[PDB]
Design a protein around this ligand. Structure first.
Ligand SMILES: [Cl-]
Length: 164
């Protein structure tokens, strides 16, 4: 298991524009196009991201290219952020994947807002971090995904993702 397999499980794969759990236009492996209500805006963003006239459909190769760029961007965002980088540096390789997962889903700014949870992770107070992380809109809106990420922080293993 690695970060790419992990996020492919959490996000799935869809080759036509769809709406994500918040109602926003998305494509591929959880690539957000726009928070605009306008399907035309979403198609225009898609064409710009892919570099051609897509009419809202992309190939699997194109989805995986956007996915590679998005994983790379999430990692680079962690390492440039003063609140995230020291947490990331303190963690083992499995728990690093959990942090990347959060940043992929809710952005660098959203995750840096989890001040108390980040402190607990940095101190390796895993059971306590897991409780604090669950006191969140994130957990209440996407509880099955949040539970898998939280279990990964708590245990340092991939068990939440095996048999999936
Ligand atoms: Cl969920």
């Amino acid at each position: 298991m690695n970060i790419f397999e992990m996020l492919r499980i959490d996000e799935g794969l869809r080759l036509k524009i769809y709406k994500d759990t918040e109602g926003y236009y998305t494509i591929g492996i959880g690539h957000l196009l726009t928070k605009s209500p306008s399907l035309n805006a979403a198609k225009s963003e898609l064409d710009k991201a892919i570099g051609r006239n897509t009419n809202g459909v992309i190939t699997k190769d194109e989805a995986e290219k956007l996915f590679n760029q998005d994983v790379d961007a999430a990692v680079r965002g962690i390492l440039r952020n003063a609140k995230l980088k020291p947490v990331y540096d303190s963690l083992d390789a499995v728990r690093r994947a959990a942090l990347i997962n959060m940043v992929f889903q809710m952005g660098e700014t959203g995750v840096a807002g989890f001040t108390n949870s980040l402190r607990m992770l940095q101190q390796k107070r895993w059971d306590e971090a897991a409780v604090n992380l669950a006191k969140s809109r994130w957990y209440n809106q996407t509880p099955n995904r949040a539970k898998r990420v939280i279990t990964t922080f708590r245990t340092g293993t991939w068990d939440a993702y095996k048999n999936l």
